[PDB]
Design a protein around this nucleic acid. Structure first.
Ligand SMILES: [K+]
Ligand SMILES: [K+]
Ligand SMILES: [K+]
Ligand SMILES: [K+]
Ligand SMILES: [K+]
Ligand SMILES: [K+]
Ligand SMILES: [K+]
Ligand SMILES: [K+]
Ligand SMILES: [K+]
Ligand SMILES: [K+]
Ligand SMILES: [K+]
Ligand SMILES: [K+]
Ligand SMILES: [K+]
Ligand SMILES: [K+]
Ligand SMILES: [K+]
Ligand SMILES: [K+]
Ligand SMILES: [K+]
Ligand SMILES: [K+]
Ligand SMILES: [K+]
Ligand SMILES: [K+]
Ligand SMILES: [Mg+2]
Ligand SMILES: [Mg+2]
Ligand SMILES: [Mg+2]
Ligand SMILES: [Mg+2]
Ligand SMILES: [Mg+2]
Ligand SMILES: [Mg+2]
Ligand SMILES: [Mg+2]
Ligand SMILES: [Mg+2]
Ligand SMILES: [Mg+2]
Ligand SMILES: [Mg+2]
Ligand SMILES: [Mg+2]
Ligand SMILES: [Mg+2]
Ligand SMILES: [Mg+2]
Ligand SMILES: [Mg+2]
Ligand SMILES: [Mg+2]
Ligand SMILES: [Mg+2]
Ligand SMILES: [Mg+2]
Ligand SMILES: [Mg+2]
Ligand SMILES: [Mg+2]
Ligand SMILES: [Mg+2]
Ligand SMILES: [Mg+2]
Ligand SMILES: [Mg+2]
Ligand SMILES: [Mg+2]
Ligand SMILES: [Mg+2]
Length: 205
RNA sequence: GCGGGGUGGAGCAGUCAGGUAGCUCGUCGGGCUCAUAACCCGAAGGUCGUAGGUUCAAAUCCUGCCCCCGCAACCA
RNA sequence: GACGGUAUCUAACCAGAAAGCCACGGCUAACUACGUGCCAGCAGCCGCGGUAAUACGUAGGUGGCAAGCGUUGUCCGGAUUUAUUGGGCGUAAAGCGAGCGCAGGCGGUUUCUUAAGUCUGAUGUGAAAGCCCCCGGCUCAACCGGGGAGGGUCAUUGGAAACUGGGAGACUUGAGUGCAGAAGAGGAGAGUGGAAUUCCAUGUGUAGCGGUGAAAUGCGUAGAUAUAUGGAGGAACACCAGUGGCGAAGGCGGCUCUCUGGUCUGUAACUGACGCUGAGGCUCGAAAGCGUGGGGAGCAAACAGGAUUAGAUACCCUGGUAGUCCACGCCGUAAACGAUGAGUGCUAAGUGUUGGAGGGUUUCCGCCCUUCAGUGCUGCAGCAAACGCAUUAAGCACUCCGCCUGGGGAGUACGACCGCAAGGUUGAAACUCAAAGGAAUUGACGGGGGCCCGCACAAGCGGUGGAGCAUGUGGUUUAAUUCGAAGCAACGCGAAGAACCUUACCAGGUCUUGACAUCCUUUGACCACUCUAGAGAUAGAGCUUUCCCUUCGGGGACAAAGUGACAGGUGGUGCAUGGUUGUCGUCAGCUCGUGUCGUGAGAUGUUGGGUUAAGUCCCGCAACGAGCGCAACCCUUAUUGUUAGUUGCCAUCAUUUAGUUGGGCACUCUAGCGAGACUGCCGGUGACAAACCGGAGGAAGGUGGGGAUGACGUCAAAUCAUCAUGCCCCUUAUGACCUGGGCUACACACGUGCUACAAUGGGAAGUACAACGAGUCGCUAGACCGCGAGGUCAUGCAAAUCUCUUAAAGCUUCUCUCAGUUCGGAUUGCAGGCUGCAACUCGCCUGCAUGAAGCCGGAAUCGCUAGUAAUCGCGGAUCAGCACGCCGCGGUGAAUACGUUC
RNA sequence: GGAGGUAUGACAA
């Protein structure tokens, strides 16, 4: 059957909100500025392994923390690239933006990056079994307590869609204390959308 | 000309022996079934071919007339 | 010298004139694009084609072969698929139903002999050409020539002599005879016994009997059935009785006698291979059937009647003829079965039993051992596709016979033989299919079995189906009644808000780089507002008309224009998809790694014994572990310590109409941090286990109550209108703007609701008790106006402070008095109130008037196991306004569960 | 434990 979102289930139990601000009358305004901020960054930094955006609001300011496995690319030479990002965000948001780059250690354990990686390979006509197996290898070598991956759609151009997935170790989706990262990424192929889902189980909380 | 028949959609009673219009299957509506059949429950469908008489009252008795069916309509 | 100026040779000249055919899904060497969309076509077989075809057609490539390449036809091969080499017959095709036997095939030991078979030597011959072998010739090869070899079940002749055969002997083990015993439903004939059924007669006796799931037909007051005593007649033989016995098989069951077959065991006197098998022939051969003559109790095709049923030419019931029985003569077939031909020998064991034999003990009885022949069970080796067989082989061998060669057409046709007939025996082909089949495996299923669970049923309570109305759906209607959902799992569903908007539909009016983007662009503002026209969109006017900066060259931020790329689709396909969801179901399962078993698919684990809500745990186990689920971690609710004490609270105090003010946070409460339940404690049961039963303490006890949490998968289930997206389609349009209409249309059918049908009530008055929640142009106190909906001035509160919000059921009095009513409140008239630019189509509310059906609801059907159902209100999301819906909240608060057949 | 005997359901997918 259908399963609860692994992150939505643990938000407020062991996982915290990414939108780390409070508001009453500007809640609607702030929320949809965040969506424009998140959408803009996902376009500007599509080439950098940007995983988590945390937004904090202090009066007229907007503090934005960007987690990236390629901090050097995001920053650029002498902060050229991030500085061009604050100006673009300042124009977009209409207020002061501070951008904080955070280094993602162990990107092989970050579901979004792993899912994005598998998605890119499928777009290169890489064997879908191969793409998932080597993602599993990297995650386990990085020390994951377990990893689970799945690809759905018209695999290798098959007329009839099907889902093929692989797992290793433990992925206890019902254990609420388990720190299970999840991501869904889409790979657009010649035949249409392929859905890549990744579950990574790190040290339980 | 000799008989037989006209009553609900069809097939039949009731007609002799006057009082109250039904039975069989079917039709329609609802149930039951995944569905159909079977089954269950409700409803509808004729003032008795048609028009006069007799009577307190007729589908019934009397009379006519129109329809439908089997016979006959000529023998050495 | 016909060939003939032919071969051949030499010189010059030019790459110049000289390649195709088939195949490329697998077999099978060779792959991609278009085109086509179960069409056109391909195809040797399997099979391709249903709008993204390496299989159809074309092209480019590629493969094979090449002056050829392919197709068709024919033969051999592959084909062990007629098996001599070289197969089979328990269940796949295949053992004749069984015996007796002529011919034939085969046949024990041995001496001598022969030598037909067999083996061997020599000679003769097996023409030439041809294949093959050497050797030469043509420039090579083909081709030609020379020399050989090979080829015969050949003849003549000389040898050998084991084996088969012939001849003369000998032998005793096979086979038979004798002698001595053993058992038997073996057969035939003639008698005979009891039990029971039926009929008949006679008493007794009185209204039923009989029968089925339930009934009826039937029998009986003309005396039944039952009961007693008898008589008649037919058929079959209870107990004994037993994978017990006998027989070739079919078969044979009371007892007695007469005639008669066979088998088994000892003995070892006799014969001396006399044997085995056996086409063709002959004999026997269940049951049904046939003929002639008897018999006829019971049973029972047919048949009759009664039922069942949609129909029943059935199953069921009541009857009942042939037949079943006897004699004689036919028939000659059966899942005539061990679905396993006969004879012989050989190849572990264990244990029953029938008939014998021998010995060792036992007083006998019997026990012990050895053995023969049957009959069973279990089980090695071996065999087998497996199932299984296994000294009673399906094992290892030899002999003879029968039979088989894909399924269907066929055991049919024709012919023949046999038969009284019914039919039997023998037995094809055309044509057709690419399968039929055996065993085993995993699932699913069963009107199979066992064990369990769930408001599944049962036990209850209240409903739905009837009425009115609300709402969704079908249908119909319509210019449109937008699209989606359809068994559970569509139908108060997407819609948590259709008057306009929404809106996707329709009519009319309109626009064509566009309502919305990006990119180029240009002598920069654009909007905005104003007026006319217009339903409006829109036009035609007036009027204003932009910033950032750097050095002054400009650029960049934004329009707005221009123009071409492009935009735009709630257009299609949820059978191309991602995501999301329902569903089985919070049911307990679903698997993997390694090992092991199996030829194999698979199996094991995961089953078994317990236990649990649970694949929960324990124990056992050819398994040992692991993962996804279960459980736990999370939320809420029930008790409590501590910290905190306002806006919450008021016990001890004084005060106020007031928890008011002072004062205090003690209690309540709010909220963080903690405490508490863990089978932890105790008794019993249990396999020293898991666990179960009860107990104490405790606010809470065994998951405390509830929630969140939904395994691998299932239904090509839902969604291309949330979004996204492959492919397809539209592009002055299927895009876009506007006003109006529609989505709310109504002869009808269904789903879900609401309100009722009254007195456990209606009406009036008085009085009490919640919780979850919401609030800024919002929630609104208080006062005043209005019958009311509400209006007016005005107040507090961005809020455990103010407000919505004095909850309704409830309780206490009064009234009504069973009435379609003082029940019910549909429908309609009139008059108003709000929100809105506007409520005619289409809003909600109010007053007055009006006062419909409905008297508790057919078949059928739904929810619920307690703070639940039932009933009562309250808040919220969407929302200007608008729900009887949805989500949540508290009040009051039951009935029942024996039990698991359905 | 094992063994011989006593109503209906298009076609493709
Ligand atoms: K082909
Ligand atoms: K052979
Ligand atoms: K036989
Ligand atoms: K010889
Ligand atoms: K005898
Ligand atoms: K006879
Ligand atoms: K024996
Ligand atoms: K054939
Ligand atoms: K409906
Ligand atoms: K889907
Ligand atoms: K295994
Ligand atoms: K506390
Ligand atoms: K699409
Ligand atoms: K879409
Ligand atoms: K309703
Ligand atoms: K209703
Ligand atoms: K009262
Ligand atoms: K309106
Ligand atoms: K009702
Ligand atoms: K509202
Ligand atoms: Mg190939
Ligand atoms: Mg082709
Ligand atoms: Mg051959
Ligand atoms: Mg068979
Ligand atoms: Mg057979
Ligand atoms: Mg007979
Ligand atoms: Mg036969
Ligand atoms: Mg024996
Ligand atoms: Mg019940
Ligand atoms: Mg109703
Ligand atoms: Mg659909
Ligand atoms: Mg509209
Ligand atoms: Mg409109
Ligand atoms: Mg689907
Ligand atoms: Mg299982
Ligand atoms: Mg488990
Ligand atoms: Mg076990
Ligand atoms: Mg759980
Ligand atoms: Mg579908
Ligand atoms: Mg689309
Ligand atoms: Mg509607
Ligand atoms: Mg009444
Ligand atoms: Mg329950
Ligand atoms: Mg309640």
């Amino acid at each position: 059957g259908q399963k609860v979102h692994p992150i939505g289930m643990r938000v407020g139990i062991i996982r915290d909100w990414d939108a780390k601000w409070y508001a009453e009358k500007e809640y609607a305004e702030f929320l949809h500025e965040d969506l424009r901020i998140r959408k803009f960054i996902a376009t500007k930094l599509a080439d950098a392994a940007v995983s988590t955006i945390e937004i904090e609001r202090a009066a007229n300011r907007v503090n934005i923390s960007i987690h990236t496995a390629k901090p050097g690319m995001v920053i650029g030479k002498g902060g050229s690239e991030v500085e061009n990002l604050r100006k673009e965000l300042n124009k977009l948001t209409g207020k002061r933006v501070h951008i904080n780059i955070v280094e993602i250690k162990k990107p092989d354990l970050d579901a979004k990056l792993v899912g994005e990686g598998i998605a890119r390979q499928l777009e290169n006509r890489v064997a879908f079994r191969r793409a998932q197996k080597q993602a599993i290898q990297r995650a386990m070598r990085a020390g994951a307590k377990g990893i689970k991956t799945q690809v759905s759609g018209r695999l290798n151009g098959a007329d009839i869609a099907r889902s093929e997935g692989y797992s290793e170790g433990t992925v206890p989706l019902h254990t609420l204390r388990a720190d299970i990262d999840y991501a869904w990424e889409e790979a657009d192929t010649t035949y249409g959308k392929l859905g890549v889902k990744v579950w990574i189980y790190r040290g339980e909380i």
